[PDB]
Amino acid sequence: SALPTPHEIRNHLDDYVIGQEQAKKVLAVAVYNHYKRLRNGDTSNGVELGKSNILLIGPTGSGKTLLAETLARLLDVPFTMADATTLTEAGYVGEDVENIIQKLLQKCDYDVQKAQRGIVYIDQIDKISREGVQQALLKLIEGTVAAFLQVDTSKILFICGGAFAGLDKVISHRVETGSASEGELLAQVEPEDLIKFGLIPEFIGRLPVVATLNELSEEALIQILKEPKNALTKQYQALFNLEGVDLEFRDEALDAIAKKAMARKTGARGLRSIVEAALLDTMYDLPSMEDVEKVVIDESVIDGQSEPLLIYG
Amino acid sequence: ALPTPHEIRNHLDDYVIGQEQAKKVLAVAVYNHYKRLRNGDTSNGVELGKNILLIGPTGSGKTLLAETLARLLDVPFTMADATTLTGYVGEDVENIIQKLLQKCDYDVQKAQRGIVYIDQIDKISRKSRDVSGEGVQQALLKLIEGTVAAVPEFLQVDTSKILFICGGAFAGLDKVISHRASEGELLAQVEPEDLIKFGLIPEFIGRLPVVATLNELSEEALIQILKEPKNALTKQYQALFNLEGVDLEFRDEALDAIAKKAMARKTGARGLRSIVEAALLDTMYDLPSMEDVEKVVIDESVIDGQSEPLLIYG
Amino acid sequence: ALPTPHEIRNHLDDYVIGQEQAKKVLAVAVYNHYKRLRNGDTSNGVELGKSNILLIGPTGSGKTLLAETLARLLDVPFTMADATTLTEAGYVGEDVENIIQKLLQKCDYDVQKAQRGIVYIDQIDKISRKSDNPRDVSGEGVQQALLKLIEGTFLQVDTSKILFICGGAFAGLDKVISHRVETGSDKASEGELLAQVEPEDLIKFGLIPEFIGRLPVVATLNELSEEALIQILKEPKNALTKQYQALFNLEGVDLEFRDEALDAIAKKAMARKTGARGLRSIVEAALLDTMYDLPSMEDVEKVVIDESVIDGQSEPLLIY
Amino acid sequence: SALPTPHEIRNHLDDYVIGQEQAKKVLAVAVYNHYKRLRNGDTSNGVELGKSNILLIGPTGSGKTLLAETLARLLDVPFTMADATTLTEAGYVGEDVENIIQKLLQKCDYDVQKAQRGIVYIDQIDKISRVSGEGVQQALLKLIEGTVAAVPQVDTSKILFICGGAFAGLDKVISHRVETGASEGELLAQVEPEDLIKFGLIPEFIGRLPVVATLNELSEEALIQILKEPKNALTKQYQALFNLEGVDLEFRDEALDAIAKKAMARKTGARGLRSIVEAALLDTMYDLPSMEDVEKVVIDESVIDGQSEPLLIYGK
Amino acid sequence: SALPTPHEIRNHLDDYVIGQEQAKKVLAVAVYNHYKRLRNGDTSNGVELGKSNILLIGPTGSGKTLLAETLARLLDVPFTMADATTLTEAGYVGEDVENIIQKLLQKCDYDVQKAQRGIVYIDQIDKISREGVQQALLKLIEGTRKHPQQEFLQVDTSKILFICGGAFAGLDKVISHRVETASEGELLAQVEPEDLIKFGLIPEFIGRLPVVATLNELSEEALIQILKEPKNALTKQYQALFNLEGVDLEFRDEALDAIAKKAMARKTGARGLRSIVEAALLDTMYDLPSMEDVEKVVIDESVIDGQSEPLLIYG
Amino acid sequence: ALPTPHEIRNHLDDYVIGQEQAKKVLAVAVYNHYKRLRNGDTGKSNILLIGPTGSGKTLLAETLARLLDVPFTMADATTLTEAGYVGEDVENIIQKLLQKCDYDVQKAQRGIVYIDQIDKISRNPSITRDVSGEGVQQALLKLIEGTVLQVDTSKILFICGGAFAGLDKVISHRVSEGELLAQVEPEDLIKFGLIPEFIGRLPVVATLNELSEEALIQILKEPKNALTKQYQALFNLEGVDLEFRDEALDAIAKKAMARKTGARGLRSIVEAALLDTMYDLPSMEDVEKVVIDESVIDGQSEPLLIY
Numbered sequence A: 001s002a003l004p005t006p007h008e009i010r011n012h013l014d015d016y017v018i019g020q021e022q023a024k025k026v027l028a029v030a031v032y033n034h035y036k037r038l039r040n041g042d043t044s045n046g047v048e049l050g051k052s053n054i055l056l057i058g059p060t061g062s063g064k065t066l067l068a069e070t071l072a073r074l075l076d077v078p079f080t081m082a083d084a085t086t087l088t089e090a091g092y093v094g095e096d097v098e099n100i101i102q103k104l105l106q107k108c109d110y111d112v113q114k115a116q117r118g119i120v121y122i123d124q125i126d127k128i129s130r131e132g133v134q135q136a137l138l139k140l141i142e143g144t145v146a147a148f149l150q151v152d153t154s155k156i157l158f159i160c161g162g163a164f165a166g167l168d169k170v171i172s173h174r175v176e177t178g179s180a181s182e183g184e185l186l187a188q189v190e191p192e193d194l195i196k197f198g199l200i201p202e203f204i205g206r207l208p209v210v211a212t213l214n215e216l217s218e219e220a221l222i223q224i225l226k227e228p229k230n231a232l233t234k235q236y237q238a239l240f241n242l243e244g245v246d247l248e249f250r251d252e253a254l255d256a257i258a259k260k261a262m263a264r265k266t267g268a269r270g271l272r273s274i275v276e277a278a279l280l281d282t283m284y285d286l287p288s289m290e291d292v293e294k295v296v297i298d299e300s301v302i303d304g305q306s307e308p309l310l311i312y313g
Numbered sequence B: 001a002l003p004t005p006h007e008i009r010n011h012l013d014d015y016v017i018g019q020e021q022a023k024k025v026l027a028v029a030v031y032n033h034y035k036r037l038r039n040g041d042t043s044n045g046v047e048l049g050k051n052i053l054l055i056g057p058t059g060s061g062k063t064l065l066a067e068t069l070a071r072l073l074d075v076p077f078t079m080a081d082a083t084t085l086t087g088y089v090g091e092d093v094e095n096i097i098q099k100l101l102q103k104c105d106y107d108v109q110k111a112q113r114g115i116v117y118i119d120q121i122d123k124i125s126r127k128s129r130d131v132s133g134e135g136v137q138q139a140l141l142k143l144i145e146g147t148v149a150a151v152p153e154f155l156q157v158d159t160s161k162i163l164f165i166c167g168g169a170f171a172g173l174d175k176v177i178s179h180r181a182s183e184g185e186l187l188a189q190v191e192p193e194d195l196i197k198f199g200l201i202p203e204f205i206g207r208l209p210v211v212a213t214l215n216e217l218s219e220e221a222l223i224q225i226l227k228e229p230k231n232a233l234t235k236q237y238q239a240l241f242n243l244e245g246v247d248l249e250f251r252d253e254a255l256d257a258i259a260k261k262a263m264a265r266k267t268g269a270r271g272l273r274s275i276v277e278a279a280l281l282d283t284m285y286d287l288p289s290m291e292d293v294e295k296v297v298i299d300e301s302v303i304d305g306q307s308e309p310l311l312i313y314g
Numbered sequence C: 001a002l003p004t005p006h007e008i009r010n011h012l013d014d015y016v017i018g019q020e021q022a023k024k025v026l027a028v029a030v031y032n033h034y035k036r037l038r039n040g041d042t043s044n045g046v047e048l049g050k051s052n053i054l055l056i057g058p059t060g061s062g063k064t065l066l067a068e069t070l071a072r073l074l075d076v077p078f079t080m081a082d083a084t085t086l087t088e089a090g091y092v093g094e095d096v097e098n099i100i101q102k103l104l105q106k107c108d109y110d111v112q113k114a115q116r117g118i119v120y121i122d123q124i125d126k127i128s129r130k131s132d133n134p135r136d137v138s139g140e141g142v143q144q145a146l147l148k149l150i151e152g153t154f155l156q157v158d159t160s161k162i163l164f165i166c167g168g169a170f171a172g173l174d175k176v177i178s179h180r181v182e183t184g185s186d187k188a189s190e191g192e193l194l195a196q197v198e199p200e201d202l203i204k205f206g207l208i209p210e211f212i213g214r215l216p217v218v219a220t221l222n223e224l225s226e227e228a229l230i231q232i233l234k235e236p237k238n239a240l241t242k243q244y245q246a247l248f249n250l251e252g253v254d255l256e257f258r259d260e261a262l263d264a265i266a267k268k269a270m271a272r273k274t275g276a277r278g279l280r281s282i283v284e285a286a287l288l289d290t291m292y293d294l295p296s297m298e299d300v301e302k303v304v305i306d307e308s309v310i311d312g313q314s315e316p317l318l319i320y
Numbered sequence D: 001s002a003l004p005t006p007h008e009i010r011n012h013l014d015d016y017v018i019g020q021e022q023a024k025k026v027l028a029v030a031v032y033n034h035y036k037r038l039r040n041g042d043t044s045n046g047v048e049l050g051k052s053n054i055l056l057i058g059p060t061g062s063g064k065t066l067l068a069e070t071l072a073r074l075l076d077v078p079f080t081m082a083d084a085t086t087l088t089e090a091g092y093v094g095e096d097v098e099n100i101i102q103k104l105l106q107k108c109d110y111d112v113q114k115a116q117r118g119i120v121y122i123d124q125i126d127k128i129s130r131v132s133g134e135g136v137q138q139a140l141l142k143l144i145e146g147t148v149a150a151v152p153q154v155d156t157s158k159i160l161f162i163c164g165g166a167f168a169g170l171d172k173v174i175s176h177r178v179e180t181g182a183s184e185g186e187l188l189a190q191v192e193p194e195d196l197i198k199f200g201l202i203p204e205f206i207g208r209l210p211v212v213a214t215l216n217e218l219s220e221e222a223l224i225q226i227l228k229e230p231k232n233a234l235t236k237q238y239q240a241l242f243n244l245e246g247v248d249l250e251f252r253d254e255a256l257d258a259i260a261k262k263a264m265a266r267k268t269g270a271r272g273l274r275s276i277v278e279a280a281l282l283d284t285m286y287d288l289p290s291m292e293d294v295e296k297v298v299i300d301e302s303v304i305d306g307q308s309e310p311l312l313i314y315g316k
Numbered sequence E: 001s002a003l004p005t006p007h008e009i010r011n012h013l014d015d016y017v018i019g020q021e022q023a024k025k026v027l028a029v030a031v032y033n034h035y036k037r038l039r040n041g042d043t044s045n046g047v048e049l050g051k052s053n054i055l056l057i058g059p060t061g062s063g064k065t066l067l068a069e070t071l072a073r074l075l076d077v078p079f080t081m082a083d084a085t086t087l088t089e090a091g092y093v094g095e096d097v098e099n100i101i102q103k104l105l106q107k108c109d110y111d112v113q114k115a116q117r118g119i120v121y122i123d124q125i126d127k128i129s130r131e132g133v134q135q136a137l138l139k140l141i142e143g144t145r146k147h148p149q150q151e152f153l154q155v156d157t158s159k160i161l162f163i164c165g166g167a168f169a170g171l172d173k174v175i176s177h178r179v180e181t182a183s184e185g186e187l188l189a190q191v192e193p194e195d196l197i198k199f200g201l202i203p204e205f206i207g208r209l210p211v212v213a214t215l216n217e218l219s220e221e222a223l224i225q226i227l228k229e230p231k232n233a234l235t236k237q238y239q240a241l242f243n244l245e246g247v248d249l250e251f252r253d254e255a256l257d258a259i260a261k262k263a264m265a266r267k268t269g270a271r272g273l274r275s276i277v278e279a280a281l282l283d284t285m286y287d288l289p290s291m292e293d294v295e296k297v298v299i300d301e302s303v304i305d306g307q308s309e310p311l312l313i314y315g
Numbered sequence F: 001a002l003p004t005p006h007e008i009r010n011h012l013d014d015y016v017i018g019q020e021q022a023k024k025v026l027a028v029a030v031y032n033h034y035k036r037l038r039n040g041d042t043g044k045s046n047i048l049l050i051g052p053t054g055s056g057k058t059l060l061a062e063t064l065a066r067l068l069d070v071p072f073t074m075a076d077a078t079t080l081t082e083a084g085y086v087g088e089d090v091e092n093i094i095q096k097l098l099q100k101c102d103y104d105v106q107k108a109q110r111g112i113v114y115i116d117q118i119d120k121i122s123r124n125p126s127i128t129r130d131v132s133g134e135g136v137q138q139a140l141l142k143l144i145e146g147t148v149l150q151v152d153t154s155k156i157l158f159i160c161g162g163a164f165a166g167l168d169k170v171i172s173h174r175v176s177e178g179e180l181l182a183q184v185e186p187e188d189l190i191k192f193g194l195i196p197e198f199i200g201r202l203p204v205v206a207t208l209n210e211l212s213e214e215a216l217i218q219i220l221k222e223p224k225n226a227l228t229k230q231y232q233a234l235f236n237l238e239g240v241d242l243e244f245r246d247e248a249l250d251a252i253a254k255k256a257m258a259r260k261t262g263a264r265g266l267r268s269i270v271e272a273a274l275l276d277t278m279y280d281l282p283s284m285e286d287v288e289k290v291v292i293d294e295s296v297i298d299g300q301s302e303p304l305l306i307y
């Protein structure tokens, strides 16, 4: 079938992820090129090998994991996740690194041809760096056939996410020449700066594409609460719907939740825990009573002193 | 069936004392689960992430809670241990499913409605053998989502519909939370990032959105820990006394007396031994010198320590 | 024929002064341990306690002596190790087994008698990884590495059978127990507190749960009282005073220790918290000058008074 | 004469690597002699014969790694890479180093003999040198020596070892020892084992690396040629990518020159060429599949300034 | 013969070592008692006597090793030295322990009895603490017709006297931490086994070293004294050397002082004395044998400055 | 009679160029040593040679023995490492000294012994079969210290040579390279890895800063793993015979001295002279190649080709 254009890929990412427009443009092109190459074959002349990788650099709860998973759905392609930190410091993990492929081949259902089209996301790669574990990924990225893995890994798409908390410093040290501000600094990121961070030149060489994500602002989280197709509010509204009740979040309440999430520095992943808690009591005794609609205000969220308003019929 | 969360918690009250906030959470999580299973996540134009993570000391009631939930809902229940993790390691995880079918009488549907309790998940992740356990957690994570083939008609069961509860003491988690007696308040502030820092993979945590914490030891739990386990203290001591040709007998009141004292010291299961040892120390010392048929431990011997174990001479 | 705990404690009374509670505990622990071994634990499948012991007491309280004496009384091979040497190494894990080879040496290279052996590890509190007295990664590695020994695994010997006794002073442990046992606003005495000791107290101290779980039997030693030390200076067959008198004897001189001097020595020892181990260094210093110019003089006897010891200012009385 | 001659080997290197003629000549002879020895036999003559290990000294992105990989490909020999810094610090210590032999066996299909022929490239050697780390040099040196047990074995003596390093401080010690009078390429050639001992490498380790090859820093024209000439050249790759769209991508010579200049300012070398090109064509590659034009022309004013977008031409 | 009294022992040490009067008193007693024990026997009058090995604690170049050597010399007893650092970090340390015993037998002529009366000095004991060698040292301290060594092990280490020296740089702080609620020496006098425990020495090891002595840092007046007064003083040695040439070598007091000063700047202690003197006399010793002088005079200008050559007097 | 320090240095000047300072020290050290033996005692003037490889250390030792007409023998610390699987490899060098001496006990005691690569013995062991150099210091020290058919080593003069590559650093830290070595003190050698007991036996310390041509030349041809022999083997696999003219060996040494590189700097010089040749050699077929000094010194002309 036809393959979506980078323009289209980016648009569908806008539906699941708020902001981060620059990173999505990058992913859209990197991904499009990847599959566009795979279809034409390894390469035109046998030279490129048809292997491309992406490196996501952004704060925790910025959307890295979401972006990777979302790309997979849009392209109807097997997706698996792994964590670099669980992997780091183990020898057996080099052997369980193949467990990533034994984890992907489970989700692609041993099709192999589907597995090669698949996408793999490695999280917390910055943590492994202070490198032997990195080699494991390099070997992972590469697969050869002389004519447990039937398909070479070179065809599968690798996306590697990390927070790189110290990287922002090493960037500033190199660009310390004249004659917040985190977003501007990430853009200036170069492979050499990742080397100083502790990533081996070998590993970076195979991660040519570099996308940077900004730290979610207040309004960013608010939009994340409502806009995305599977936004928290939507999810809970559906849950309350099964009870025949209508759940409504006042704008001031959503704002109230975002603020709390920023204070925790948890990012977007800490949004659920906050909402779950605000609606805990209600969801508990709701099945016992019959009301028409429930309204959540900022007072019930931030203070947690006030219970949500109940409207009957 | 499908009792309201209010009804569920009240049923938990009869089995476990205290831990009202945890009960409330389990009630909702379970209710939503089965109410959401019937309807299904599909349709309505929305998808739901949807699993519970029990965090409490040893002998707090976690396991008790899991089993009870299943009994109240007339749903097949199966327990598993993270520290057993029993080359491929793939059958280990599949067994859990198979066992669930055996208990379920081989009904594909009832097995989907089943509940599965995983213990020692905290042990798989260590802060500050290890690899076999963490690899199984990745294999375990792979069995919460997606169907699992029947063991080689082959009408297998989708693993997603099954509810998964994971219990763990998480001794080191207490510290990481405070860095990010009266520990309960710290537990409430627990967040998915604290789990990450503890050693839990992000993908796993994301699969366990619901988190329940316990702030008090469970009396019955300890009582059962004293006699039920194969390595139970009571059995260990009855064995020692048996080499002397003596018959050691614990009165139920004595066992309860032991638990209540352990709870007052917040020592937990580990603090049970020091209490039993102290109760039999004098006896064990002058036992090999005298000749009696059996010896009986009563609550008056434990709590007050005033009375010594009753001797029966023959 | 195994000795009843009554008998084991009685013979410990001959070599060790005080610590009656700890001796009762060791007596039971030991008896049960070998009682289990000799009956081959349990045929088929039954449960049996490891019976490993954790000695907790101040320096020079008798921990080492108790361990050594236990072995002698049971005519069983005995070997000592120090947890400090162990810490910090992967190579020391391979050194940990060295403990076993040494046990085999004293054991005549007999595998079964080695299984009967007793192993005492000193300064276990030192390896504990904690903020107090602040390498951590390495010390823990030993706890875990030595932990494997405790359970039991080209000698071919299995350490399960061998009895483990781990001693430590646990200087900080006293505070952590008080912080827990306290009520409202204290505790009578350290000895009274060490009794209230729980595994969770050892946990906060720095010991890992899996390790403590392998040390079920916990014995606690009291700080030897003035009168104990004093007895240790006189009563034992190789008592310090007896050794120095013998020395002064081959000089033709008679050495006399006044009771006030012996008590003066005990007090010094208690202020230094060194226990009995600190006794000799104290006596030595008090007789140093005397022994130096002794072979040059020609007197009948020398009398040690309190004033010579405590003040260290006056010289011993010389009688001609 | 079934084995490739040094002449033959260098020529093959010229296709993958641009410039560094002097280093290529040394590698060619070092390698040829190494295998020439293996085929006849090790120390067959009464006279003691020492295996020749290579030590590549050159700035980052000079071609060190590439040269090592290319050598193995020409000889149809198993090649594995390791990193001095990755192995510098490990709980397992030198035991790990053996695992690299395991890696050589993986590529090798676990053929003992083929692993012998294998080539091993160690990167960032300059890093371990200051110091218990320098002990790892000993563990790494013992490999060069040989007799390490394999997983079954593998004679590390027969295996060829190439050690690459930037040696940023080396330039100074060379000019210091000689007292000297730029001239970087001239100073590197003057390098001696004693300059490396002063750098921090143990004498026993440098003694096992008899062959020393130095690389000049890339010329302005070197980069330009690297962009165009090599079979795996960037321009060729992007042109191919743009061709899948049916579009013809063309780089103005002024543009290639513009790219090289940027790369030199970064000091990144050839490695930083792709990041520069990627950024220039990023926007165009994003919205290209949405529009239909015959060709795109990349000029220097679109690269350097990044101000103007590429020229779009509609073919008819 | 008769055993030398501690009084005698100390006086003999006074001739080879300057100062450290306190340490010498200690060593004198420890040594006397030790050999007085061997002659009488391990057991005396129904009571077992305690072996009194010695631990020397002093700065580098203070006289620890010399003290050890000198003791052996005045007792006419076999002496061997060993270094704790060579042993550590290896499994073959235990074998090297036997190597030390072998060394003692060599100088001893392989006379087992003479070897058991010998003395062994272990240097840099402080370096071994942050310990398995402490276990090996402990065991060694405790005691346990053929041209070859045959029964080399017929000798047990029980009888041998072990002296352990160390600078213990960190020990000075550990002692201060317990006192709080030359000048360094006053801190070292208060040293207790407990302090050595904290330093890294295992309790079982310190219990085998019941005798502890301390040395003071060497003052400038001390170095000057060392240059002239000992029996084997540097000045005396060179004077004897110049004496073979029929020349009289004279050191002016200001010169001896100049040497000391220079020695203190290098902080080598008495060790760096010889190298300073040899350099000052090198040129002179080189061209001496080819000229006829009555005597040669070394002034401070010749030593410290090195600018002027020694004064040459003709006869 | 006995040669004056003046006479001894003069005889050393004819064998080794430069190193005037070390030659003085050795002269006095040796003179005093034998002057103390003569006329009887009434005792260690042992020497420690610190200099780069190819500096003349070994040559100076030999030369001192010949002018004194005294038995001489060399030993290698590296070889003495193992000290033999059984026994002392050390006692072997006293036997060698006696053989050269015809087994005359006295002449042996007058003898001179040179131990090379002492800096190598100083110290993860990783259960290595090879003996620890730290222990070798002891085995070597047992030798220096007199024993007790029977020979006492106290009377024999010991000279220990070494490069001490790391020593230059240690001395700069304690506070160019030539002037630094002059400031060497026993403390530096202890920090290097030499035990205080060993250093105490080596009171005299001499330093060499420049290389000697004769030594370099010898190192190029004599050793069994000599550069010339290695390259000849290489060219031999090609069926070609490689011949180094003596004038070319001398030309190589000069180059190495001018660059103060030392022995390890020789290979880089030879490699550059033969690079082109080895590069296009496998393409042509000739009987032999001849390297002359004009190939080396000027690099002007290419080596001679015989077909």
Ligand SMILES: Nc1ncnc2c1ncn2[C@@H]1O[C@H](COP(=O)(O)OP(=O)(O)O)[C@@H](O)[C@H]1O
Pocket: A016, A017, A018, A019, A020, A058, A059, A060, A061, A062, A063, A064, A065, A066, A067, A161, A223, A224, A228, A268, A269
């Ligand atoms: N920009 C965004 N728009 C919509 N949802 C988001 C966004 N960022 C994060 N989320 C939501 O929050 C959760 C955590 O985000 P995540 O992808 O883990 O960020 P990171 O990868 O940086 O940790 C996701 O499950 C996702 O649904």
Ligand SMILES: Nc1ncnc2c1ncn2[C@@H]1O[C@H](COP(=O)(O)OP(=O)(O)O)[C@@H](O)[C@H]1O
Pocket: C015, C016, C017, C018, C057, C058, C059, C060, C061, C062, C063, C064, C065, C066, C167, C224, C232, C275, C276, C277
């Ligand atoms: N209770 C005791 N009875 C007899 N002797 C003792 C006692 N406590 C200590 N000692 C003496 O002190 C020495 C060391 O005691 P030790 O067992 O090491 O105490 P700890 O183990 O607490 O350090 C012994 O050799 C012994 O003679």
Ligand SMILES: Nc1ncnc2c1ncn2[C@@H]1O[C@H](COP(=O)(O)OP(=O)(O)O)[C@@H](O)[C@H]1O
Pocket: A201, D016, D017, D018, D019, D020, D058, D059, D060, D061, D062, D063, D064, D065, D066, D067, D164, D226, D230, D270, D271
């Ligand atoms: N001399 C060269 N000629 C052609 N391409 C080069 C050259 N040097 C580097 N490159 C390119 O740059 C990238 C990295 O080069 P690399 O071999 O890693 O140099 P180094 O080893 O010094 O880092 C490669 O992908 C390669 O295509």
Ligand SMILES: Nc1ncnc2c1ncn2[C@@H]1O[C@H](COP(=O)(O)OP(=O)(O)O)[C@@H](O)[C@H]1O
Pocket: E016, E017, E018, E019, E020, E058, E059, E060, E061, E062, E063, E064, E065, E066, E067, E165, E226, E230, E269, E270, E271
């Ligand atoms: N107090 C002293 N009196 C005389 N000579 C000394 C004294 N201290 C050191 N020396 C001299 O210095 C040299 C080294 O002393 P040594 O005892 O080895 O140092 P350390 O105290 O570190 O063991 C010896 O050769 C000795 O002659």
Ligand SMILES: [Mg+2]
Pocket: D174, D177, D178, D190, D191, D192, D194, D195, F259, F261
């Ligand atoms: Mg140079």
Ligand SMILES: [Mg+2]
Pocket: E270, E271, E272, E273, E274
């Ligand atoms: Mg001296």
